[PDB]
From Swiss-Prot, chain B:
Belongs to the fimbrial export usher family. This is F1 capsule-anchoring protein. The chain holds residues 260 to 336 of 833 of the full protein. Coiled coil: none annotated. A probable role in capsular biogenesis. It is likely that the caf1A molecule binds F1 antigen subunits during the extracellular secretion process. It is found in: Cell outer membrane.
Length: 75, 71
């Protein structure tokens, strides 16, 4: 049994109210997590390209962002 | 919002039967869970002491060294 160095990808941000954070790829919804207000960290996600992150807030407001992603080469 | 890569190390090993694996980080119990026979990974953990109790009642204690890269 051994200790292994792994690197997991996450997307971090801030939610205004307590919200639903949706992660889209190419139109396809991949993540969907309800979070408390403030900072959030989204584990479990799908190379390189772009994600779309919508923060559906309690009052019906949608904070929409484009999140560029990339997988780094490791020796 | 931004994409980022977190250092997320794991303790890997092979359990012969449906086992219980306990991981100690210097005295404190850090992980204790039941695993099926075959390979196992232990994620999201707060030298390590890894104890593998197996179905037949046999137990082995391993000293697994751990390190964190400097950034
Ligand atoms: Cl929508």
């Amino acid at each position: 049994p051994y200790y292994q160095w792994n690197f997991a990808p996450v997307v971090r941000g801030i939610a205004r109210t307590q919200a639903r954070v949706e992660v889209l790829r190419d139109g396809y919804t991949v993540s969907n997590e309800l979070v408390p207000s403030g900072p959030f960290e989204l584990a479990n996600l799908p190379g390189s390209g772009e994600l779309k992150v919508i923060i559906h807030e309690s009052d019906g407001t949608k904070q929409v962002f484009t999140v560029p992603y990339d997988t780094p080469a490791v020796a």
